[PDB]
Each structure stands twice: as C-alpha cells, then as structure tokens.
Amino acid sequence: QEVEFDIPPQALGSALQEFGRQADIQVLYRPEEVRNKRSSAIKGKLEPNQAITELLRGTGASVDFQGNAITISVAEAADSSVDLGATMITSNQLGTITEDSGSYTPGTIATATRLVLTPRETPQSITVVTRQNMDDFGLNNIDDVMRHTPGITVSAYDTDRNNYYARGFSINNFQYDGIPSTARNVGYSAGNTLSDMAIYDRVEVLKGATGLLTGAGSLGATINLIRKKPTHEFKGHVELGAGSWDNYRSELDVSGPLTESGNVRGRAVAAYQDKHSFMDHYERKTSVYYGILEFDLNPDTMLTVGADYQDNDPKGSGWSGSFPLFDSQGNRNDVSRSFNNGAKWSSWEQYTRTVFANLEHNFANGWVGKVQLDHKINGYHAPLGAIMGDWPAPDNSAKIVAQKYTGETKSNSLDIYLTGPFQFLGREHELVVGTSASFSHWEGKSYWNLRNYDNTTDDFINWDGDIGKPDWGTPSQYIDDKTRQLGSYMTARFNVTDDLNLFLGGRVVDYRVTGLNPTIRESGRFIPYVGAVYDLNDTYSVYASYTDIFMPQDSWYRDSSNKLLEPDEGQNYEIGIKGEYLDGRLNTSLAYFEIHEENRAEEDALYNSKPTNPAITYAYKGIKAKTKGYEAEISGELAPGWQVQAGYTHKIIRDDSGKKVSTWEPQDQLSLYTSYKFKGALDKLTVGGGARWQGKSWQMVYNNPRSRWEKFSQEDYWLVDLMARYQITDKLSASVNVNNVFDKTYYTNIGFYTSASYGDPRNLMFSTRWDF
C-alpha cells in the first residue's frame, strides 16, 4: 500500500539505500552499475512501484519485484553471458525480512559470512524458518521451531530444557541479530532453549562448523534469531490462542512512525502464555516484552535502541527425564504418559533480558559500517526436587533428589564491522572486516546440604508431586566465572569469472575464562574459511567449503596427567548443489558433508577403573570423531497457492573406538511441512499439514540392580500435523492446529541419568488473530 517518501536527488547508491530504508524493503543493486549515476527526486505519499520507477527515471535501470526485496539492474545491449552471483550491495544488512512474504523460503541471508547473500550464493548448508511458517504451524517458541527444522532433532533433558542436535552434535551456538551469546554450559545460557517467537522475524540455522562468525563454539550448527523491526507505515495485531491442557496465549504487536516526519520509528510487543500440560501437575507461565526505536540522525546514519525481556516460570519441573527406567529390582517401569517425577513446588525458572544499541552508517563508496552494543542478562532460579534413582521399591515407596541453583550471567558485547565493494582485476568483489569483544560474568549460589529432610515418598504409582519442600540450608558453592572472547575477522568474496565466486576469510580468536577453576587461555587461534560456488545453469550451482571452529574445554575435562584437554575442534567439508527457481521464489539443496572432530572429550576408562595419580580422580582423553552424511532440502512455492519446506538428512558419527555415538539422534530423518491457499470461491481458506519421520534410535543404559548394560530402542515412527486457517474478515482470521494427529506415543529421551521423557500426545490449538 501507500508510503510517505522524501528522497532528494543524489548518488544512485545513496538513493537506493535511502529507498530501502523508507520502504521497508530490501534493495539489492550492483556497485559498478550505479556508480556514475544519480536519482530523480521523489516526494510525497506514493506506492513503492510508482515510487521506485520514478526514482530511477533516467538512470537506465529496471526493477525486479521480489517479495520483500527489489533487485535493481541496468541492462546493456551487449551482454555475453550472465554473472548470476555478481557482487551485490544491499540495503538491509540482516537480510530480507520474511514477515509478510507469504513464503517458507528466505530471501537473502547474512548468517554465513556477514555478507548479504542468497541461499544459492552461500556455500554452507543454511536452513531458515520463516515468519509465515511460524505463524501457520503455531510455532510459538524456539523449541517448536527446532522441532520443525529439517535436519534438527530435539531431545528432552527435562521438562524445562531440550537438546537440539545437528549432524552428530548438540548445538550450542545461539545468536541474536547476528551477535553470539555466551553458552559454555547451562550457567551462561538459561532460557536459550525457551525463547518466545513473538519478537522474531525468523530463525536461521547455519548447519556445519560455524567458527567464522560465532568465534569459539560447538560443532554441529549455529541458531540465529533475527528480531522484529519497526516500519514506516503503522501496523499491528492482537492474537488470542487456546489449546489442550489449559494452554492460553495472548499477544500484542505494534509498529510504526512516531513523529509526523518519519524519522523516529518504534515497535512494541508483549506476549503472555500460561499453560498446564499432559504431564501431571506441571504448569508454566511465560511473559515477554520488547521495544525497539529507530532514529535517523541523518538520511545516511541511523541509531537503534532496544530492549527485550522474557521470563519462563514453571511449577513441577523435573531434574532429569520424566521417570526412571528401572525400578529397585531392575525391571523396566511402565508409567502413564502423564507421569511426572517433579515435585509440586519444583521449579526451573529461567529469565532473559537485553538492552542493545546500534549505529549504522552508509559511507559514499556504498561501503557501510556498523557498531552494535549489547548488554545481556541470562538468569536462573531453580529449586528442583524430582524422584530419582532405581524406583519404586517393592513396597511402592521412592526417594526424591532435591537441590537448588540460583544465578545470573551478565554479558557485554561490542561488535564493529565495515562492509563494501571493491574493483580488483577489472572485477567487482566485496569484503567484510570486523572485530568483536565480549565479557560475561556468571554468578551463582548452589544448595545441596539440606537440613533435616525426609526425602522418601510413600507411593510411586500415584506420585502426585505432593512431597514436602526441604530446608535448603546455606549455600554450598559460590560460582564466579568470567569468560572473555575477542575476535577479528575478514572475508572477501571474489567474483573470479562470470560463474566462479571464491570466498577467502578467517577469524582470529582469543578466549580467556577466569574464575574459581584454573584459568583457561587460548591466544591467537586461527579459524580459516574457504568456500567456492560455481554456476552451472540459470538454475543450479555447485559449491564446496572448508569451515572450522573450536571450543576450549570445560575445566574439569583434564587428563591422565591432570592437564586440561586441548580445545574441542572440528572441520566440516562440504560439497553440494543448490538450485533456484521462479526468480528466487523456490530453492533446493542436495549436500554431502563430513565433519572431522578432534580432542573430543571422552572418559578414559582404563585410568578411571582405578586412579593412580592422586591429582585427578576422573580423567578424560581427547579423541577423534567423524560425521559422514548427506542432506536434501526444498523450500518455497511448489505452485501459486502452495508452499513447502522439507528435508532429508542421513548421518553416522563414530569416535575412535570405531563405535557409533550420538546414537539417540536417528541416522535418518525426513521433514515435510506444507500449506495451500485456495483460489476463487475458497480464497480465504489456507489448509496445511506436515509430517515428521525418523529412524531407529537407541541408548545403552546400565541397569544398576541387575548389573548389566541394556540397549533401549525407539523404533522409527511418524508424527503428523494438520492446520487450517480462515480469513473471515479483512482484519480477523481464525485458525486450528492439530499436532500428533495419530496420537503416536514415543520417547523424547531414553537414558539421560537413567530416565525417560515422553513426546507430546495429540494436542490442538485454536487461535484468532486481529490485524489493525
């Protein structure tokens, strides 16, 4: 619809930039094509397609509308073959917003290198869950999203923490608007598993080995959450949802200009959810607030300030799994899916809040620079009590474990980087040079010396949670950790021929963790980055990349000699093909990949059998593991009304013993989520559904009473999802989501501290949504 423009004539670059800004649209263009040109003045209330063609009046340029992107070109009569990946400067550094695109596929993406590239142009496996996907399938938090992310497998530690694997690894890398958080363990990372989606445009997952922009981190993948932003036109909605197990949700989201001119814009979102659950006596209130304001200091310098807040507050949290595998005498337990071994009062409450500011400046080169300041808090308040151990015993009694952990981490970050194009051998390339600093400080109390507590319960079979709460006594531990990461990085993207793009870059890292443990230093470690992308057709590209990453070990991972293991390292080797269709409206990928880990922390069993250095009591051993696997995906428009996202991933990871490892992640998985928007008589109705399939998965757990190892198997199963929406009104729609249609019962955890969690049973969600 119509928009208030005011773009004075200037360097074509500047105007395209200024237009992008004023229209809330991504504007892509070629540096060399707009260099010795200027725009015609646009002024007043207009529609963007009118506005842009008017701005380009006399420049010899054509416009290509693509969703929330417009890509600007200046055709020649000459042309001798097309440079599909030509260096393109871009108006929004985070990428193309997906909100409103109507699509399940992303537009452009800055996750891999900090350069704005399309999935076809990025030589790494990159999956994105778009704003519409989140809406259509009711994905209200990061857990929901990960469960619909192809190639991810979500598993339960306990009712209030999940594990996300990719490619053989627990994912432990989270970003916001491209800034890494600190997640060395559950100290620094309270709430990461639980972020509400009310404040996000999309989530982007870069599978592989992501050292280049994460710095120090886990192998497997990075998860990158992109915040919602303000708009120059007014808009918002209010949403109310009601689902199984007294699950209630409400949401308000407002955005728009805040001054007659347009130079200060804001966006505000509040979301409140309160849900009981299929698990007995578990409940959880979650509260979220967010505000961002933009200010234009001048047409080419913008300042952004913002804050967000989320509180996750449960009753009946478990500590490990939902129930124990074996009873006292060694038999497997059969329990209702409702069973929950948390105490009534037991709670693993987790909170997060951020204050952040940035400054973005267009330089005249079409170079642009950016300074991000972040202050992040991750806090936890955790009085846990859960039935634990080989129980029941024969007379139906059991025993509780109770411990209390409270704490906060405070983090501060500075990220500064510069991005721009440049001529080299008569061709146009681009570069990102950046540097970053973070300091975080974890601070906690632990309680475990309980005073005069009777931790037996007289009834396993009807466990209700209804046990007393212990006197926590005085703190048993003070935690005081300081981590400090400093990084510098540079990537260059050369356009070597009309169809070869070479990527060369690296990050140099310095990592100090200081505290109550022996200091852990790592200094001037080089993380390399090499990538190539060869065009074959208008449609398909091949690509390879060698990417790297390391995480210095936790301080208790020491060895025979009580020396800290070297940093857990991994390279990912990838070759693949990517295809692109309907002018970027649909993408496909088929990738082959291999990760080589080294210094993987493993037990050291022969030492452990009988420790012989009084120094260390439980040594480890830094071994080598490999992932070998392949992956296929598709996202976007199959036909006009029809969207999909779907993937297939095969994996096996083995360590030096030769044995398989991560054997709880299935070797094979498939995802397919789709919706269809009818046309004509039924054009107000979208229908969708999805299906999630995986193969055999198992664990070795030790049955302690019978003194033997047992394999535990989850046989391959399907989960099926269904979805309907109706736009009753220009401004009001209603929606139904049914999940786990065939009420499959399966396990989300078998083996974690000898326990088991169940997957969600069939559940529905009804919601309405009201757009002002």
Ligand SMILES: CCCCCCCCOCCOCCOCCOCCOCCO
């Ligand atoms: C150090 C703290 C930083 C605070 C940052 C939080 C900012 C919160 O901003 C709240 C403002 O939100 C703006 C919502 O936009 C809607 C305004 O619409 C104008 C009303 O429309 C009437 C006529 O158009």
Ligand SMILES: CCCCCCCCOCCOCCOCCOCCOCCO
């Ligand atoms: C063990 C659980 C089994 C549950 C199975 C349920 C299967 C039936 O699902 C379909 C439900 O259809 C109900 C129709 O309701 C229509 C949605 O209306 C939304 C209300 O809009 C609000 C207006 O302000």
